[PDB]
């Protein structure tokens, strides 16, 4: 499972890979982990599925009966507060990070960071999941703020391509929404499309010379490719 | 703890050390086993000292409650009742206490022990604590129940005495109570070790 | 226990409490914990003092019977090797931390053994305890190429963080400096908790404590 | 499960017997309590277990058969009514926070017409009693320790039709068998029995 | 989510609490950039050890009395020692609820003369000294601080406390694993709590003695 | 994480004929480091003539000395301004103690004070409120160390010499601080400075002493 | 634990030209007393005196092999064995077995005949030596006659003065220990001479 | 624990006594089992505990004393060697592969003078052992459940220079006080004493 | 603890942190974790330090051994098999995660790495350490094959430097050495001069908006850094 976020000037875009595991088997391989909460701000949610569902429903539902009510956009802070509030007085039943990533014509495009253990920080891009910490030394080194919205995506999914390559319990497709003053925008690529894959990486393609022919010289040579050699 | 309490033909006689251990560590030498709840009752220590004393207080309490109320003092079987209704309720909470309770009632003498789980017996001899198994062995073999109170209260002494001294649980000051018709009187209060010299002189 | 160990310009300088408990009980108020490896080697001890002074009374006899053997004076690589072989022999039960230093033809050298058998050389170590909080002082006061007197201070001061803020040390500091030649142990180098409020001497004309029955034995 | 509880009914009598052991871990505090709580007239309870429990329970079940009976203008209750409420108390316990009442019965009667139109049972009654609720008429029962070399021991000897005398006997015997072969110091023994003229405490075995 | 150490000093006239800014999750450094110094009314400032969402929760509940209060009715706002006072009562009756507060708190605040340094730990237990330090300062730093403080037990200055300020943050970085080189000292003096922008200690890691021939063991 | 915790200390009282001479150590240790060395936070001062000084969790002590401190108000509101005698709050100590008695208190206690004769009494209490009245007593984790000594000078027993005079507010004041000196180096958790309190008719006085801080 | 099975106190205190090792005399089993009259204390010449605390089968157990080791000691050298070998023989044979180890405490005093110089030990069950200059102590009563010493002992003190605070000592501590008492057995040996005492403890 | 074994010394001669008592977990195997082993003729052992180690131990220790007095061509060892040669045993038990001899022991004997040369102890004695390999010479000495009882009792009643008939009745005394205070049922007790004519089955008392 | 092995055309570049810790506490901030065998093959020793230190010197042992009796330089290949031979022997009681480099004239240079379980995989490259996860989605990215000699230093300098910004457990010198025809040589970077750290990464100087003045708008406006204000 890995979900991140990163904000632009515009707005925000969320990426997030698409599998829900057994720890060692593909339960659902096409799994949809941004849930929308309003028209836009959405959420990506990792760690247990009942529990993240749980409360983004409840979320959900509680965030649009304030906007009914007060008759006027949401920010993104009512609904990171709520989260909080909500995966703190159940931290020790739910194992829940959350990921709330939005626009408001108030504060632009926003990004909060609701942790396991229950905290809230506004962030200018925030990484989670199980897949996660294989993208932080990838953010330090390639990423630099202030980008447009094509080459946050462009980014994004590249980010996402290369935590699923490496992490077991990610993979699948990777499912992008941008989030800005026009429509918010979905894009789902396949993994047979991706920007990376360690099977296609030129650098992986020579073999471990693992299985030495029995020979004569300490000379290495590759490996026994067939019984008459 | 060491306490005993013996039934005889002149009332009842009650006997305790004063000594609270705490493990391996004497706390005190003068700790107060003998608990008297009224004029006319006695209650004794034995076990969690903290419990023992709450609920003692409680039980005196309430006797003083029901003389209020019906006007006649409260009787032995009846204030040994409470007592173990109060540490039946609590059977699995983690009490720790066992005591006697010992009066002279309009019924003649009586006395109860009652337990930390609500056990409630009526019997003429007791001894219970720790030195216990030590009280039994001189207990058993010199009582009678025409003693005289002299002699049953010297049968009581030389009975603690010697679980003083084999115990390590047990010790200090031996201290006699007698329970008469009249109420209670505490006959004597001496030194585990004045004592030593005095049984097994030269 | 705190020791700590300070290379200087020309020597080592090792230093060590005096303060040994029994189990939250101060036992002894005057221990010594630096103990003898050679004329130029000497190894401070943490930890149990059982295996402390076991090991270093073990390897310090077959260093005097090499040296016997070979006839040249004993380098302090054979001893944290001897030190280092034996401890990890026994998986770290032999609960004894060292801080062994001496000087050779090479110059001075300083190592530490923690008691699973890991070695490390550097300019200054400390264990036990009270290790945390005199590191603290040496990292803040090390400059490179100190004189004696500098590091005799510096060790002195890195104990007195220990002595006063470590309840399992205290009492004095043991200050001992080895040069190319020389090996000088100062025993009182410092007692800053100095004996106060004296005492009252309470007197018992003897004869108060009874007594039954003695027999006196002329020899 | 130390003091051994025996109880047998014959034609015209049930006999129940119970060792008056109290103990304190392994200090006998008394070598003769009366173990066998008599609830109304014609019926006995012989509960064997801890004292807190026993004495409690049983205080318990009398006081709701004499308010019964208050509530009915001196209308006895049959054996079977008794016998099932006391196994409905036994069994509610173990379903609920204070726990079960770690106390074994033997519930021990003579059913008497109460009136002309009564056509109920007229003879003895017994009934086995587990701790966790368990409710059997039997001939014969026994709880404890020596609960089992008893039970062997009255399928050699007993018979539908033994008399008083034989009745005796045959406790005489069990009772020394149970003394004979239990490491338990249970020397004396309290056997009462059930007749149509009542409870009568027989003095004789023990 | 868990902060990193706390240290606390008074010199003549005025408070100094310093802290890193970084975020850790176990032993990974998740977040460098944030803000852990937070100040509470207009005279007092509060920093905690440990976890996150806990500080986070308490300085809020504790931010939202003072305001009320001086809000609703015509009063004078809570001084440093009152607001403390509330927090450590307000931790442990979250304690005895088995609900612990887990975070070690340091407060400090300053109102006209009186100047205030206290902390408080998440069981309960609360003291007040002339010096404090959390997490793994109360081993490292905090004797540093005592000597500093007994070599001159007239007062410190405001530069001679902050050097040794400086002096202890440096061997925090050197010797605690979990901590980063940009810290940040919020000073209290008698106009208010003032927060420093993040600045950084220099270092030396050039002895001859960590030269690779030495340090090998071959 | 256990919500209980232990930080040392130790407190010594012992009564006279006209006052009673209350002692603490002023030191708060926490896990392995020294929180404080001017911790005043063991004896509490409840009417003119009562102290509790308590020994164990700072925190369970903070609270205890509020709780006996509103119930002690309480008592003087009900009975139009009647301060309770040290009999009194003593018995209500130990009431309070055994309410919270399964979720106890990690305190060992003492009230120290003056009865109605004047006499000065000293009770002692465990965690869970058995409480002893006696003449003198130590509590926390110098007990074993201070106890026995006070046990030979003040008792006199196993010594074939005729009983001294009584002692006085000096020789008392003398002893203890001899006890404390002693206890001051060889207890690891115990001493850099203790506060005595000497509670006589005419007010409290106060007095400090200054040990090693090793 | 294992260590206050058998209960039992030793105590020794250096004097001028002298030293008082005293030790109680209760043998029990862990709550109570198998015997009233055993003493702690084995002499091996006329300037060493040790005493032995722990289990009681291991105290015998180590009294044994010890005196086996220095009879031996007697006949391959031809001469006593002074107090600091004995002491450094005793804690090797309590390292041998370090993981089986003995549960004895030792406690050593002895003098030297012609020089005067008083050497107290007191070993812990695994060997670590710890030889202070005023007193030593173990058993049950560890932490009380601590305390007591460290208030009655002074540095210079004369025999028929020090046999009076070890007795003192020795008493206020095993009066506030359960597993201690029935009066003390003190051996107070000089240079010239060495005198036993038995001393009236409570019966308790 | 549970068979208890009594053993006092007098002026001229020891008793011991020892329950009979053998058991499997609560049924009484036997009520009559000689746990007074004799090893030689003025020397016997009372053993308590499993009947395992019991028997295999007193078996060792009497083949082992039988050979030392063949390879010495009728020398009869004292009785402190003896003691010492068992306490080595089961000091070292503890400390091997097998683990503890779990049995407690009262040695009783009667030193006689084995030579005119001979300056050795001529009174009788009684070592108290316990299975940890704890041995101690003692007037008196109890081992089991009842052991505390009759100690007390001992204190209370037993004198220097008891007779034989004094010992006798005290005996009666501590066994009847032993079987009215413990649970377990300890009947039949096995009085034996050893007097320079050697040891005795002494049958009155029980 | 992070400790890498690059190879390029001539040899092989050896990098690592000089930090080992207790759990929380630096106990040795200047240790040496690349070992010498021979004059040309090195070890860098990752997991617990006793462990590692007695096999790298008891294997350095037989090394300087065998080297001896035969004559000849030793390969990589032997100093690989006779650590894979005591790490698999070994492997229920020491945690050790070794990293073999070498250079030997007949097949150039040789990495392999052996990780804890006990195998022997040689490879192009390697990784180890505690600290490594974060290097791997950096070696993805930022490396191609057949780099020059300074080129790969830099890179190894780069990685280790992007490892222990982010990791607790890792930090301190960087010490690389480089393996080739020519003699080993070897470097120490320190900390204040590394080519990477979070503290001089200008994407890392403005902070998380989080302690918001008590305000009457929903616009965030950054934090509170004084009283009056
Ligand atoms: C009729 C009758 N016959 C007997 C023999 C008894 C009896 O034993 N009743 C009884 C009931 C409840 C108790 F709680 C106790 C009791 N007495 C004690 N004395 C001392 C210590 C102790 N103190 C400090 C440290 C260690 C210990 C073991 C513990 N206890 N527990 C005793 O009743």
Redesign the interface.
């Known amino acids: 499972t890995t979900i991140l976020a990163v904000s632009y000037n515009g707005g925000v875009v969320l990426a997030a890979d698409s599998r829900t595991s057994s720890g060692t088997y593909v339960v659902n391989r096409a799994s949809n982990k941004l849930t929308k909460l309003t028209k836009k701000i959405y959420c990506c949610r990792s760690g247990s599925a009942a529990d993240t569902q749980a409360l983004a429903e409840r979320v959900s539902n509680y965030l649009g009966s304030y906007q009914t009510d007060i008759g006027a956009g949401v920010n993104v802070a009512t609904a990171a507060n709520l989260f909080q509030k909500m995966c703190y007085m159940n931290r020790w039943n739910i194992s829940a990070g959350i990921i709330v990533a939005g626009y408001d014509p108030i504060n632009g495009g926003s990004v909060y960071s609701i942790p396991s253990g229950g905290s809230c920080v506004k962030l200018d891009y925030a990484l989670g999941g199980s897949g996660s910490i294989f993208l932080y030394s990838f953010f330090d080194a390639n990423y630099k703020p202030g980008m447009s919205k094509s080459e946050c995506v462009a980014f994004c999914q590249r980010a996402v391509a290369h935590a699923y390559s490496r992490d077991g319990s990610s993979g699948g497709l990777i499912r992008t929404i941008t989030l800005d003053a026009d429509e918010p925008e979905d894009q789902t690529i396949p993994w047979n499309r991706s920007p990376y894959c360690m099977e296609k990486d030129p650098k992986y393609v020579t073999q471990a010379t693992q299985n030495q022919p029995f020979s004569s010289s300490a000379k290495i040579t590759g490996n026994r490719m067939s019984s008459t050699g | 703890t060491t306490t005993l309490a013996f039934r005889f033909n002149g009332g009842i006689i009650v006997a305790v050390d004063s000594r609270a251990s705490t493990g391996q560590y004497i706390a005190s030498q003068t700790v107060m086993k003998v608990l008297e709840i009224n004029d006319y009752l006695l209650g004794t220590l034995a076990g969690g000292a903290a419990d023992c004393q709450y609920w003692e207080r409680v039980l005196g309490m309430e006797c003083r409650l029901w003389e209020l109320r019906n006007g006649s003092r409260i009787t032995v079987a009846a204030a040994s009742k409470i007592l173990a209704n109060i540490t039946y309720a609590y059977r699995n909470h983690g009490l720790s206490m066992g005591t006697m309770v010992a009066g002279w009632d309009q019924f003649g003498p009586s006395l109860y022990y009652v337990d930390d789980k609500g056990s409630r017996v009526k019997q003429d001899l007791f001894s219970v604590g720790s030195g216990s198994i030590y009280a039994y062995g001189v207990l058993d073999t010199g009582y009678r129940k025409d003693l005289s109170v002299e002699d049953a209260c010297d049968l009581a002494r030389r009975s603690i005495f010697h679980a003083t001294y084999r115990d390590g649980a047990s010790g200090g000051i031996v201290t006699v109570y007698h329970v008469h018709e009249k109420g209670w009187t505490k006959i004597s209060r001496d030194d585990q070790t004045k004592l030593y010299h005095r049984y097994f002189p030269s | 226990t705190t020791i700590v160990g300070v ?1 200087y310009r020309d020597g080592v300088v090792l230093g060590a409490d005096t ?4 189990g ?8 010594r914990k630096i103990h003898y490896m050679a004329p130029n080697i000497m190894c401070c001890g943490a930890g ?3 295996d402390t ?2 090991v270093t009374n073990m390897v310090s006899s077959h260093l005097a019977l090499h040296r016997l053997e070979t006839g040249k004076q004993s380098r302090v690589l054979e001893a944290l090797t001897l030190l ?1 072989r034996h401890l ?1 022999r026994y998986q770290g ?1 032999v609960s004894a931390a060292l801080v062994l230093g001496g000087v050779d033809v090479e110059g001075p050298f300083l190592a530490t053994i ?1 008691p ?8 200054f170590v400390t264990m036990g ?1 009270g290790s ?2 005199a ?3 040496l ?2 006061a ?1 400059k ?1 190429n100190m004189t004696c007197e500098e590091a005799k201070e510096l060790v002195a001061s890195a104990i007195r ?1 220990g ?3 470590d ?5 004095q500091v043991d200050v001992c400096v080895i040069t190319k030649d020389k090996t000088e142990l100062t025993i009182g180098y410092d007692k ?2 100095e004996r ?2 004296p ?4 007197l ?16 | 499960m130390a003091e051994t509880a025996i109880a047998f009914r014959c034609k015209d009598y049930v006999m129940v017997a119970a060792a008056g052991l109290n103990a304190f871990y392994y200090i006998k505090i008394t070598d003769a309590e009366d173990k066998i709580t008599q609830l109304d007239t014609h019926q006995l309870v012989a509960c064997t277990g801890e004292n807190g429990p026993r004495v409690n329970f049983t205080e318990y079940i009398k006081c709701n058969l004499a308010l019964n009976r208050m509530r009915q203008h001196g209308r006895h209750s049959s054996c079977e009514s008794t016998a099932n409420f006391m196994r409905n108390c036994l069994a509610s316990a173990i379903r609920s926070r204070e726990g079960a009442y770690q106390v074994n019965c033997l519930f021990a009667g003579y059913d008497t017409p109460v009136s002309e139109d009564d056509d109920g049972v007229v003879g003895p009654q017994l009934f086995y009693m587990d701790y966790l609720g368990t409710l059997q008429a039997v001939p014969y029962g026994c709880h404890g320790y020596g609960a089992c070399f008893v039970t062997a021991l009255l399928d050699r000897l007993w018979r539908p039709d033994l008399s008083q005398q034989e009745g005796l006997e045959l406790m005489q015997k069990c009772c020394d068998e149970v003394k004979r072969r239990v490491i338990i110091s249970n020397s004396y023994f309290f056997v009462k029995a059930v007749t149509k003229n009542g409870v009568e405490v027989i003095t004789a075995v023990h | 989510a868990s902060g990193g150490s706390v240290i606390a000093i008074k010199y003549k006239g005025g408070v100094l609490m310093a802290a890193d800014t970084l975020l850790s999750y176990g032993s990974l450094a998740k977040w460098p950039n944030i803000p852990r110094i937070r100040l509470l009314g207009s005279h007092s400032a509060v920093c905690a050890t440990g976890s996150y969402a806990d500080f986070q929760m308490m300085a809020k509940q504790v931010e939202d009395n003072i305001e009320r209060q001086k809000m609703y009715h015509n009063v004078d706002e809570l001084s440093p020692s009152e607001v403390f006072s509330y927090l450590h009562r307000s931790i442990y009756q979250k304690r005895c609820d088995f609900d612990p507060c887990l975070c070690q708190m340091v407060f400090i605040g300053v109102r006209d003369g009186e100047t205030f340094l206290a902390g408080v730990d998440d069981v309960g237990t609360r003291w007040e000294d002339d010096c404090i330090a959390t997490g793994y300062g109360a081993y490292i730093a905090l004797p540093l601080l005592r000597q500093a403080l007994e070599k001159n037990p007239d007062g410190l200055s405001r530069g001679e406390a902050m050097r040794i300020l400086t002096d202890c943050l440096r061997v925090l970085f050197y010797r605690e694993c979990r901590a980063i080189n940009k810290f940040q000292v919020a000073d209290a003096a008698s106009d208010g709590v003032r927060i420093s922008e993040p600045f950084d200690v220099e270092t030396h890691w050039e002895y001859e003695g960590y030269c690779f021939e030495k340090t090998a063991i071959i | 994480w256990s919500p209980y915790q232990d930080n040392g200390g130790t407190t010594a009282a012992i009564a006279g004929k006209d006052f009673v001479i209350l002692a603490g150590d002023t030191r708060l240790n926490g896990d392995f480091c020294l929180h404080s060395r001017h911790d005043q936070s063991k004896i509490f001062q409840l009417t003119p003539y009562t102290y509790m000084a308590s020994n164990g969790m700072q925190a369970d002590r903070l609270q205890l000395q509020q709780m006996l401190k509103y119930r002690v108000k309480w008592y003087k509101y009900n009975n139009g301004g009647k301060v309770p005698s040290t009999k009194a709050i003593a018995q209500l100590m130990s009431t309070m103690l055994y309410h919270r008695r399964f979720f106890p208190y990690y305190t060992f206690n003492m009230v120290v004070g003056l009865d109605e004769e004047g006499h000065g009494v000293c009770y002692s209490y465990d965690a869970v409120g058995s409480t002893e009245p006696f003449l003198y007593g130590t509590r926390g984790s110098a007990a074993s160390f201070v106890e026995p000594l006070l046990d030979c000078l003040i008792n006199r027993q196993h010594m074939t010499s005729q009983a001294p005079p009584e002692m006085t507010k000096e020789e008392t004041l003398a002893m203890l601080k001899n006890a404390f000196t002693g206890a001051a180096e060889r207890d690891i958790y115990t001493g850099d400075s203790v506060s005595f309190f000497i509670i006589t008719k005419d007010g409290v006085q106060q007095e400090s002493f200054e040990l090693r801080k090793d | 634990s294992i260590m206050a099975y058998s209960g039992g106190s030793v105590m020794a205190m250096a004097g001028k030209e002298c030293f008082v090792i005293i030790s109680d005399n209760r043998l029990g089993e862990q709550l109570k007393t198998i015997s009233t009259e055993v003493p702690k204390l084995h002499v091996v010449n006329d300037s060493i005196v040790y005493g032995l605390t722990g289990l009681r089968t291991d105290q015998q157990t180590f009294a044994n092999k010890v005196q086996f080791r220095t009879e031996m000691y007697k006949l391959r050298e031809e001469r006593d064995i002074t107090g600091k070998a004995f002491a450094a023989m005793i804690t090797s044979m309590l390292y041998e077995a370090r993981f089986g180890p003995w549960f004895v405490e030792p406690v050593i005093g002895s003098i030297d005949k012609s020089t005067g110089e008083v050497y107290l030990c007191a070993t812990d069950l695994i060997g670590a030596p710890c030889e202070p200059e005023d007193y030593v102590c173990a058993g049950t009563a560890a932490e009380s006659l601590h305390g007591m010493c460290e208030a009655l002992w002074r540095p210079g003190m004369s025999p028929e003065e020090l046999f009076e605070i070890a007795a003192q000592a020795m008493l206020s501590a095993c009066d506030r220990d359960s597993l201690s008492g029935y009066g003390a057995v003190a051996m107070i040996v000089t240079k010239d001479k060495v005198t036993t005492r038995l001393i009236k403890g409570r019966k308790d």
């Open positions: 290379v303060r040994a408990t029994e939250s009980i101060v036992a002894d108020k005057r221990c149990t003092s059982a002074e076991a280092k990890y039960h923690a699973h058998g890991s070695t490390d050389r550097l300019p305890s945390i909080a590191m603290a002082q990292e803040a090390y490179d963080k002595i006063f803020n309840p399992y040390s205290g009492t800053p908790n106060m409020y005492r009252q001497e309470v018992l004309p003897p004869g108060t404590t009874p007594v039954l029955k003695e027999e006196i034995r002329q020899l």
